[PDB]
Amino acid sequence: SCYVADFLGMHHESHEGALYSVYKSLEWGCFLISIGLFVFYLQQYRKKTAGWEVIYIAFIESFKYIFEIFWPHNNPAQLNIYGVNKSVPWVRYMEWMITCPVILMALSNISGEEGEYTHRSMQLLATDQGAILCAITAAASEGAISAVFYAIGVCYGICTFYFCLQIYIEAYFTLPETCHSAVKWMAVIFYAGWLCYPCFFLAGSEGWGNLSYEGSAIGHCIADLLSKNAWGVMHWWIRCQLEEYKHTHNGQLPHYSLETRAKMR
Amino acid sequence: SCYVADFLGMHHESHEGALYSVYKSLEWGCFLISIGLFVFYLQQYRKKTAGWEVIYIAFIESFKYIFEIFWPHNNPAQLNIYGVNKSVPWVRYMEWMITCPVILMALSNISGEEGEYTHRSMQLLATDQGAILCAITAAASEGAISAVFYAIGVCYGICTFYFCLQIYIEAYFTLPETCHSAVKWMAVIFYAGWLCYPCFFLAGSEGWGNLSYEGSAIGHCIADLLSKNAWGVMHWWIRCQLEEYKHTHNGQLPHYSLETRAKMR
Ligand SMILES: *C/C=C(C)/C=C/C=C(C)/C=C/C1=C(C)CCCC1(C)C
Ligand SMILES: *C/C=C(C)/C=C/C=C(C)/C=C/C1=C(C)CCCC1(C)C
């Protein structure tokens, strides 16, 4: 009556092949980009173009990726769940929980002024929290429980996406014209990246697919380069454009308040 | 070369004694209080005295406690971690992650007006997120890793407590006189309850103590009755007093803006 574990990273694997090389190279590249962006944002801080949100995101991502590179499978980075015989990437989900709220806070503070926050920002944060928590619970469970939690997380995510779309449209119609193009791209980067995470979940060992750990982590690396680093670069670019507009227009941005939008789409 | 699990709730335990009876009675009582407060807040919603935060907190607490009563040890409510041989109360920590942000959001929105949120509210939310995530990581790990994560969570918690103290002092010096007493009590209920969670952690199977699951859960039940239900009742009471003041004073609360405080203590 023995019990062998058979979790990811316990039995020795012949880590060879082009896919593993690409995997490690992409982790190293993401770490390097994150740390470089961290330094660059630290230098840009004094010009009020890079807020604490992007710096924190880059910092946390750098630690995430260094732990991935050197201790991907040693706990607590890998949570080994016994009865379900599952391997949860707890480092990945912890990084999600840290950053996604900060990404949404930066989105709600795209310009940096005071008094622009609203109750809907807090509701957005709550929905994102629920979505990611239910994703973790689905990852740590099996069977119908996992599917139910995935569905609840999907509902939370639909609400979160609707709120974020409202924020993006408001930013587009309030921010100066010079930023409009940038905003569109950022929105794409927001939706192209985020939407990747739910699908990999279905295709990986978590969920009901059969992706290798390396392929799933490669997809997550790309989705992180998109959702975090590119999104932060766009955020910093937009803030720089806003600073230039402030310099050209006596320091004040155009003032729109107590209006309505979102008609039709 | 066999491996027996020995997690909480696997080997049959003779669930008998006065302590178990008190344990189950307190879980049932907390569930009943939470659901009753949920209904009561739903009725009070239309008078703008009970916000969505307390309703959500009561709702989530009711589900937490029903799952505790009926499936405390079945996963995903109990995460069984293999190499570390630990039993993480994932339902408890999920409920923490859901509610603590909402409690802080309600604290930052004690009055309910628009434009009262600030960047410091978002930083507070980030610090609370980090604190609870590090608490979970410590719970799921062992040895020096757990101690290090506990220390980082403690630092996050000190920052969170400092921010909350600032919020409480601002509420005390901005809200009407009639509410001052209430505010003090709420602060106590906030600090008496929250400070209980770090200590039980040290004394339980999580951490480095030897509390029984039942005693730890009893302590957590009391700390939840204090931090959530009593705190929500005080929040609703304060909002009712504010509504009365608004009725007596043409609907507007006293207006204080762009001032400073926190000198000395
Ligand atoms: C930096 C990391 C980010 C932005 C991660 C985002 C992750 C998601 C949006 C995940 C969503 C979901 C799952 C992965 C599974 C359950 C269903 C969702 C939609 C909540
Ligand atoms: C509704 C539940 C609440 C308010 C739970 C609160 C929990 C804490 C404040 C926990 C704090 C910590 C630990 C339990 C362990 C690690 C150190 C702390 C301070 C982050």
Side-chain angles (χ1 to χ4, degrees), chain A residues 97-213:
Chain A
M97 299 282 313
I98 295 166
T99 55
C100 293
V102 181
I103 299 173
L104 299 171
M105 291 188 271
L107 183 56
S108 310
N109 194 23
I110 190 166
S111 68
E113 293 83 3
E114 266 280 278
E116 276 204 353
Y117 291 116
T118 65
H119 290 120
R120 297 292 299 274
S121 296
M122 299 292 174
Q123 293 179 356
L124 169 77
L125 284 169
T127 67
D128 184 76
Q129 195 84 332
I132 310 293
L133 285 171
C134 285
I136 299 164
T137 311
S141 64
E142 55 167 35
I145 302 299
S146 296
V148 172
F149 271 105
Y150 190 96
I152 297 169
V154 171
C155 292
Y156 271 113
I158 301 299
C159 293
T160 301
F161 285 22
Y162 179 68
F163 295 173
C164 293
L165 178 47
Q166 296 294 321
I167 298 173
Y168 275 117
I169 298 171
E170 211 189 4
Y172 185 106
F173 275 92
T174 61
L175 298 180
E177 294 293 328
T178 288
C179 294
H180 278 176
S181 296
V183 170
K184 293 187 286 185
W185 276 101
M186 197 169 59
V188 173
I189 295 173
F190 186 83
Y191 282 108
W194 283 56
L195 278 177
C196 285
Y197 300 103
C199 301
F200 295 139
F201 197 99
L202 290 175
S205 179
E206 65 287 355
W208 306 264
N210 50 23
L211 287 177
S212 68
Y213 172 68

Side-chain angles (χ1 to χ4, degrees), chain B residues 22-77:
Chain B
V22 172
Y23 175 25
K24 273 310 179 189
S25 296
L26 294 174
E27 293 179 353
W28 268 112
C30 306
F31 166 69
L32 289 172
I33 299 185
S34 297
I35 194 77
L37 274 170
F38 175 69
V39 176
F40 168 80
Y41 294 144
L42 285 171
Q43 294 213 76
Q44 297 294 319
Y45 186 86
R46 294 179 66 188
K47 293 187 286 185
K48 290 156 177 174
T49 60
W52 71 267
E53 300 93 339
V54 296
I55 298 168
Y56 196 50
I57 292 163
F59 195 67
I60 293 297
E61 202 189 345
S62 302
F63 293 97
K64 187 269 183 182
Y65 276 110
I66 200 70
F67 281 117
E68 294 293 328
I69 293 159
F70 290 109
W71 306 284
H73 296 314
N74 295 114
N75 47 316

Side-chain angles (χ1 to χ4, degrees), chain A residues 1-5 7 10 52-53 56 60 67 75-76 79-84 90 93-95 97-98 101-102 105 108-109 112-115 117-123 125-126 129-130 133-134 136-137 140-142 145 149 156, chain B residues 1-5 7 10 52-53 56 60 67 75-76 79-84 90 93-95 97-98 101-102 105 108-109 112-115 117-123 125-126 129-130 133-134 136-137 140-142 145 149 156:
Chain A
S1 61
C2 297
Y3 168 86
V4 297
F7 291 104
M10 293 177 71
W52 71 267
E53 300 92 339
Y56 196 50
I60 293 297
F67 281 117
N75 47 316
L79 288 179
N80 292 152
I81 297 165
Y82 160 81
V84 184
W90 174 240
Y93 298 152
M94 191 160 174
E95 190 277 331
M97 299 282 313
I98 295 166
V102 181
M105 291 188 271
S108 310
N109 194 23
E113 293 83 3
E114 266 280 278
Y117 291 116
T118 65
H119 290 120
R120 297 292 299 274
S121 296
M122 299 292 174
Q123 293 179 356
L125 284 169
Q129 195 84 332
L133 285 171
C134 285
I136 299 164
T137 311
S141 64
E142 55 167 35
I145 302 299
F149 271 105
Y156 271 113
Chain B
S1 61
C2 297
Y3 168 86
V4 297
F7 291 104
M10 293 177 70
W52 71 267
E53 300 93 339
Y56 196 50
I60 293 297
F67 281 117
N75 47 316
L79 288 179
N80 292 152
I81 297 165
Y82 160 81
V84 184
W90 174 240
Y93 298 152
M94 191 160 174
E95 190 277 331
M97 299 282 313
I98 295 166
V102 181
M105 291 188 271
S108 310
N109 194 23
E113 293 83 3
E114 266 280 278
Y117 291 116
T118 65
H119 290 120
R120 297 292 299 274
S121 296
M122 299 292 174
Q123 293 179 356
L125 284 169
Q129 195 84 332
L133 285 171
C134 285
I136 299 164
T137 311
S141 64
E142 55 166 35
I145 301 299
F149 271 105
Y156 271 113

